[PDB]
From a paper:
Here we report a detailed structure-function analysis of the kinase ThiM, which phosphorylates THZ in one of the first steps in vitamin B1 biosynthetic pathway. The quaternary structure of SaThiM is a triangular homo-trimer with dimensions of approximately 72 Å on a side and 47 Å thick with three independent active sites, each located within interface regions between two monomers. The following β-sheet strand 7 is antiparallel to strand 6 and following β-sheet strand 8, which is antiparallelly flanked by β-sheet strand 9.
Out of this in silico selected set of molecules, two were chosen as the most promising analogues for further investigations: 2-(1,3,5-Trimethyl-1H-pyrazol-4-yl) ethanol, hereinafter referred to as compound 1 (cpd 1) and 2-(2-Methyl-1H-imidazol-1-yl) ethanol referred to as compound 2 (cpd 2). The structures of these complexes could be refined to 1.87 Å and 1.62 Å resolution with R and Rfree values of 16.86% and 19.90% for the cpd 1 complex and R and Rfree values of 18.24% and 20.28% for the cpd 2 complex. For both compounds the N3 is retained and a second nitrogen atom at position 2 and 5 is included in the heterocycle of cpd 1 and cpd 2 respectively. The overall coordination of the THZ analogue compounds in the active site regions of the ThiM trimer is remarkably comparable to that of the of natural substrate THZ. Both compounds form a H-bond to the amide nitrogen of amino acid M39 and show a similar orientation of their hydroxyethyl groups. The activity of ThiM was analyzed in vitro, as described in the methods section, showing that the specific activities of cpd 1 and cpd 2 are approximately 1.5 times higher compared to THZ, however show only 1/10 of the efficiency (kcat/KM) in comparison to the natural substrate THZ. Cpd 2 has an additional nitrogen atom in the heterocycle and could, like cpd 1, undergo a TPP imino tautomerization after fusion with HMP. As a result this substance could be channeled via thiaminase (TenA) into the bacterial thiamin pool, where it could act as a thiamin antagonist equally potent as pyrithiamine.
Residue numbers in the entry:
A (entry chain B): 1 to 262
B (entry chain C): 1 to 127, 140 to 262
C (entry chain A): 1 to 130, 140 to 264
Amino acid sequence: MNYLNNIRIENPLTICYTNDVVKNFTANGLLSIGASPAMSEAPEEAEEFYKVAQALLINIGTLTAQNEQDIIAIAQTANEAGLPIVFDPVAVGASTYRKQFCKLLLKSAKVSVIKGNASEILALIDDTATMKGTDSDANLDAVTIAKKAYAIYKTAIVITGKEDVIVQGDKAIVLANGSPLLARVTGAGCLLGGIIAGFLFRETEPDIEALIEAVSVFNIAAEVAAENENCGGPGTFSPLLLDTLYHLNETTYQQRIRIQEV
Amino acid sequence: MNYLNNIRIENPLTICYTNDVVKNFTANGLLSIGASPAMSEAPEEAEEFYKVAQALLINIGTLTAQNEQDIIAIAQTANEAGLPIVFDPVAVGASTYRKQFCKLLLKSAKVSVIKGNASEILALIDDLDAVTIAKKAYAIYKTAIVITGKEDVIVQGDKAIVLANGSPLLARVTGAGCLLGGIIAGFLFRETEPDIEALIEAVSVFNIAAEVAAENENCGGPGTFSPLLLDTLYHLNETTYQQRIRIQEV
Amino acid sequence: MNYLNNIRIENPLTICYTNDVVKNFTANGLLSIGASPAMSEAPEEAEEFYKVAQALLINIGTLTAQNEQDIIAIAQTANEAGLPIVFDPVAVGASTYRKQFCKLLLKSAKVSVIKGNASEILALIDDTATLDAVTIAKKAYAIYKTAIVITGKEDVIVQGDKAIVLANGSPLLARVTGAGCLLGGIIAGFLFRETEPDIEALIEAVSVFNIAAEVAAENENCGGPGTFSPLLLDTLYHLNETTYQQRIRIQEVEE
Ligand SMILES: Cc1nccn1CCO
Ligand SMILES: Cc1nccn1CCO
Ligand SMILES: Cc1nccn1CCO
Ligand SMILES: [Mg+2]
Ligand SMILES: [Mg+2]
Ligand SMILES: [Mg+2]
Ligand SMILES: [Mg+2]
């Protein structure tokens, strides 16, 4: 629990350009770990905000025409500022609109972490038309998808699922913490993207240990919240998750973390 | 509890074009019953999304110029795709801006359910019990009508039913009624003329869950009620449903 | 607890033009005290809504080009309707974009209450004839001739010939996004269409909110910022005069 202590003490300003369903929950989850969220979407204030921020999250869950040019512009402003970007290509596999936009974004800017579920990351890389020799209709595992994506974008890849996978440089790790109740809370994965942004501390090429810790804090909090005697389902789980992020300590972290290399 | 079982197993993709105050809660409510919510507002992806979706909710609670043309366009896309529309004309009686828009929408697309409170549905058909209003509206639009109130009324074809479940705490949670629109969408399974039994089950699941949540020892008011509602939707079983449902045919 | 009884009985329509992170919580908080929130942002319906509303909140937390001109237009519609405006210049000190906009709004329209933290209000008054919150609030009052509410560890209100300091609340409030945003809404709920509100209304609004927060954080089921938020809403819903009078902490009153 190294980096979480620093979040709690430093209160990193974490800019979130995220979807309209999850803004409150993402901001609350960032506040619970001690970060300082700001949902700023105006390009007119990006240069000022970004100079003093520690990371930017771009999540395209409710992407519309209102957002497209602005997201590209701020991504470029983040690059120029040296502000690391976490990119969550929500539902990219569901439409050509989203596929085209994500391709455009990742041709326009260097991001620092790309985070999605297996189907999202597979759709990204399938659309690239680069993966000569790979059958995409075959049942590719998340580790394989993550390493292929890493080869394409040379950017840390985080694939969420029953087990989570992180690939950064030549290290790949698999994490096995969490709760099924997380899929039953709409902001959960989207919040994770914001939590990962919270752990970056302005590092454009984050250490894999930061990413391991971000994902593990979230998932272990979830596991603990779901065990709480007052957790009665996905509704009461959400407040308990935030409480459990707020209170998570090193002892619980170390006792619960389930990680495997390769 | 027939249709709920199907939602739980089949995880129906339910598209929601809804208001800015209730997106999260609507999504969460749909997740608690097993549905798969998607708050897609871009007309550019409607054709692709709608081909695989089971229903569309259109709720105009926070209608602005940004939304107007897009809502008309997606309603037409839904019609073309055979995707049933649930329409919630939130606060239509409060402004000529809303009244004009709702009139334009209902001249531009066939919807599958129109849901509102008595004043909303009255405003639609005007510009007085709920049963009478609902039947008049049904005559005009030839679409299922759900009027929420102390008692809820459903009219579909030549059948009208009154349901008497719920809690007073629902009125103190913003977007309770908005979420009920989404739950109704979740029960449609791509039927553009839904069975009245599906509509009865959608409203009853919601209002029985509300009743039961408000009886929970840990319900201390409208704040704690909302998490408990979601828990209760997640846990609702047939035994509770059948013991608690209060329905009368008109 | 005079005004709160009235809000519970009369159910004042309270229009909120507020930021995207806090809409749901703001509406729920207004519902909890018995107000009727409406998050109407369309200028096309402002004249009709405002004739029957009791107040308007304008909060610029998520200000973008989409909002700028609409906010100016609706503020003018409110002024023409006699509808009091509560203005929350969220993070105005953080960008020239927000500073310039707040300067434009306040030139264009008269508001009834300006609510912010000390850094926000200080940023508003920064380019003027020219440290503690009371001093900042009095300077702002001299410039805008409008009630000023400065939130902080202790809250300050200045209106008319009086300045007061209040000392209620919980540290868990800072860990709930939009607690302060919801407070702006609660203040709007206490206005009852008075464009020059009585300081007693403002004191009651802030005190109801912060006393509820204190009480909710003492609840045995409050385990952190997540469970606190539901309990805050429950405690606003149930707050009574006895608790109010026993807990209110008014620290200083000047003039
Ligand atoms: C976290 C945030 N970003 C924009 C507005 N908000 C809520 C007020 O802090
Ligand atoms: C339910 C929904 N629609 C667009 C975004 N979201 C939140 C979860 O991705
Ligand atoms: C509170 C409000 N303003 C616009 C929509 N909503 C939520 C449904 O009442
Ligand atoms: Mg996701
Ligand atoms: Mg309605
Ligand atoms: Mg609805
Ligand atoms: Mg504030």
